[PDB]
Structure 1
Amino acid sequence: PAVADKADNAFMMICTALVLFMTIPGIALFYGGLIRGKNVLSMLTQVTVTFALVCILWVVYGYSLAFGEGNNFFGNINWLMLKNIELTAVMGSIYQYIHVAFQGSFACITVGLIVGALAERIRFSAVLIFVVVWLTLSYIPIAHMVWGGGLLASHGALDFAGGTVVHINAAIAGLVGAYLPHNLPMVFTGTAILYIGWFGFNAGSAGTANEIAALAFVNTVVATAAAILGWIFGEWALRGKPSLLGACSGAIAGLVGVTPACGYIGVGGALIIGVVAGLAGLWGVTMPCDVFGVHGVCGIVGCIMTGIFAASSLGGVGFAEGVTMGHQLLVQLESIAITIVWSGVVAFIGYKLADLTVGLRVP
């Protein structure tokens, strides 16, 4: 019977704290510097309260429905309040309780991304309703499909740290909501906290302190740097000079782009993905809700590029046996399409339920 490795337990608990740091206070500060001053306090309150709500829903039934064994779309209700999970139960090479906390931290940042941007325009009670509906019917099934042995995983979709589950998923929810900077030092500080926490997000996705965690770590450093330079170069070419917001946006573009690819590509691949993501991000915003443009565009770019750069010939770890680059690409595209439609439909349902119960627009 599988035994827990204390080095992996230590690494994973610290990586979980780093991911939690991305929301509290990372994302809150990022949006806090971007949105109007008069709306900052309310947004910080909404991010904090919804963060709490996600943590509770996760332990009550979220983890069980996302990671329990069930079908292609949902898990089960056998792990309600973590019932039936022995304290010494092992998942991979770490205690399952750590896996519960790590996975929960990803649900939290995904929700923080959406709430932080929409807090300005949405009624408090309406956001709570939306979070409950969307976490339960979008985040949970998509996590199950991708990381819980569901539909996408069973077709061999590659998404190391959440290009689909986190980025595209949140970007679409934010964009559906949108359809329905007073402090740049604060934006920079939030970006910096997101970047440092992202090492736990990306490297921790290996589930162990091995060579894949090391690869994801280095690729995170490289893609982020390449994206900062790509964005800044585009900014200098199009606007005549770099800007602080541009530099921070480029960092996020690279972080998002490398998210699905970090544990599968070589450093050359990380550099290319970083540059392309930084430029795509800049193109995206050119064509606080702009954040959904960066997470959306860059998440799609990253997910597609994972299907290319995972190739051995391109310095990647290699595709699964019997899988051509062409096949992996189709699988990546299908995963992206499914995430977009699934998240969009659920988000629409969430916003509509809130609007029909308490009303959407801030009173």
Structure 2
Amino acid sequence: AVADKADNAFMMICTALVLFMTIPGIALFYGGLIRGKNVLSMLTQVTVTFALVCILWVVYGYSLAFGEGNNFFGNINWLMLKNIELTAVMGSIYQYIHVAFQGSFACITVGLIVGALAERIRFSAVLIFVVVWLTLSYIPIAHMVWGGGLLASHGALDFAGGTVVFINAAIAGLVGAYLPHNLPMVFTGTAILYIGWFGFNAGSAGTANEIAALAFVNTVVATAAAILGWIFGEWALRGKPSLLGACSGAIAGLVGVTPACGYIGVGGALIIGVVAGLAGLWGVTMLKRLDDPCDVFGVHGVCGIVGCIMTGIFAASSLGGVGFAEGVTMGHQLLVQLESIAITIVWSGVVAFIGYKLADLTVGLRVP
């Protein structure tokens, strides 16, 4: 197996774009939503936990997520990338690039949680939580879905992380919750998220081929459709569109197309986008009957679930998708999508609860 330089180039740039989603994307997104007096602290927690995740990833995370192990985790053979030769190839790129690309997904996932909960959680408590939850939730679930584990070996479809990233983070954040002064800044973060998301979705093909291209176009289309879907629902329910509605719409479509983007046709991307924008609206509306920043987990959670379900529909050849695996009916894919979603919800929740409680028992959770 030889590395293709075009894929290497593509995937390093894609990694830079996913890192850009956290630093500064998600930080500016939450920075505009949360209370002014809490912005500096939130930006500090996002920056430090990001650093933390980068280090844990290289030390053991990548190895435990992508080494070969069992159905649930990999191994410790790649501690500090030990035994990965510089010229080792994975797919059609150098494995070092795979390490960085995958680590960038871990970072955005943690960013989604910390940016929202930063306001309410002690600093040392967030560090502890991030260590427990990245290690016992993000990593096994990344392993199950993308590392040849349980869900993969049953043919779950999740191109860029509807489960691993969004449902996973939404549940961890909502357990957290259970336990806007600057809209131009919200818009800027949304914009940075949108752009970085082309690396997230297209780079998820692992190569600059026709699947990256499909994912790119489906990203443009689902995002746009979700913006219109959300804005129309807002105009119908609230009388007029709003900037926050526009940005929330964009996030709803981005998140909804995430598991599907590399499997569906542009027709499907359009339908998924409209449904995700409306379901996102319905979702935050319901969450707002329990404020602001954690309602965002209503978008990530509901849109992730919807997107995951609808991947199992729109991948079908007859609906313009790339087609299910041989011998797989749409019914079977649906069942497998639902099982993947349930395992993620339950796995992430249990580990989140343990994470928050461990922190609470060591340093105390609620910021003093």
Shift of 1:345: 0.1
1:172 paired residue number: 171
Displacement of 1:199: 0.1
CA distance in 2, matches of 1:115, 1:15: 23
Q: CA deviation at 1:46?
A: 0.1
Paired residue for 1:290?
295
- Residue 335 of structure 1 deviates from its aligned partner by 0.0
State whether structure 2 residue 47 is matched by structure 1 residue 42. Answer: no
Superposition deviation, residue 309 in structure 1: 0.1
Deviation at 1:230, TM superposition (A): 0.1
Q: Percent identity?
A: 100
Q: Distance in 2 between matches of 1:142 and 1:213?
A: 23
In the aligned structure 2, how far is the partner of 1:176 from the partner of 1:33?
Answer: 23
**Structure 1, residues 258-283: CA drift from partner, whole Å, max 9, x if none?**
00000000000000000000000000
Map residues 58-73 of structure 1 onto 2, 5 A cutoff: 58-73=57-72
Correspondence for 2:342: 337
Give the match's secondary structure for 2:324: coil
Name the SS of the counterpart of 1:120 in structure 2. Answer: helix
TM-score, length-scaled by structure 2: 0.98
Equivalent in the alignment of 2:331 = 326
Determine whether 1:353 maps to 2:362.
no
Q: How far apart, CA to CA, are the structure 2 residues paired with 1:153 and 1:319?
A: 14
Q: In the aligned structure 2, how far is the partner of 1:74 from the partner of 1:242? A: 45
How far apart are the structure 2 equivalents of 1:352 and 1:136? 15
Once residues 285 and 349 of structure 2 are traced to their aligned partners in structure 1, the CA distance between those partners, rounded to angstroms, is: 23
1:8 & 1:284 partners in 2: Cα distance? 38
Show CA shifts across 1:228-247 (max 9, x none): 00000000000110000000
Give 1:171 deviation, angstroms: 0.1
2:228 equivalent in structure 1: 229
Once the two structures are TM-superposed, the CA of residue 301 in structure 1 deviates from its matched residue by: 0.1
Deviations 1:10-60 (A, max 9, x none): 000000000000000000000000000000000000000000000000000
TM-score normalised according to structure 1 size: 1.00
DSSP 3-state at the match of 2:14: helix
What CA distance in whole angstroms lies between the structure 2 residues aligned with 1:175 and 1:285?
A: 12
Task: Return the offset for 1:357.
Answer: 0.2
Deviations 1:157-189 (A, max 9, x none): 000000000000000000000000000000000
- Distance in 1, matches of 2:254 and 2:66, equals 25
Aligned equivalents of 1:135 and 1:285: distance in 2? 26
* Residues in 2 aligned to 1:28 and 1:142: alpha-carbon distance in whole angstroms: 24
- In 1, the alpha carbon distance for the partners of 2:208 and 2:82 equals 28
1:139, distance to aligned residue in structure 2 (A): 0.1
RMSD, aligned α-carbons: 0.2
The CA deviation at 1:313 is: 0.1
CA distance in 2, matches of 1:131, 1:159: 24
Q: Deviations over 1:205-227 (max 9, x none)?
A: 00000000000000000000000
The CA deviation at 1:297 is: 0.2
Q: How many residues align?
A: 362
Secondary structure of residue in 2 paired with 1:290: helix
Matches of 1:328 and 1:200, distance apart in 2: 26
Q: Give secondary structure in 1 for the equivalent of 2:294.
A: coil
- Tell me the distance in 2 between the aligned counterparts of 1:140 and 1:188: 31
- Partner deviation per Cα, 1:61-84 (whole Å, 9 max, x = no partner): 000000000000000000000000
- Taking the aligned partners of 1:70 and 1:282, their CA distance within structure 2 comes to 40
Unaligned runs of 5+ in 2: 287-292
Residue 91 of structure 1 deviates from its aligned partner by 0.2
CA–CA distance in structure 2, aligned partners of residues 265 and 329 of structure 1: 15
Per-residue deviation at 1:198?
Answer: 0.1
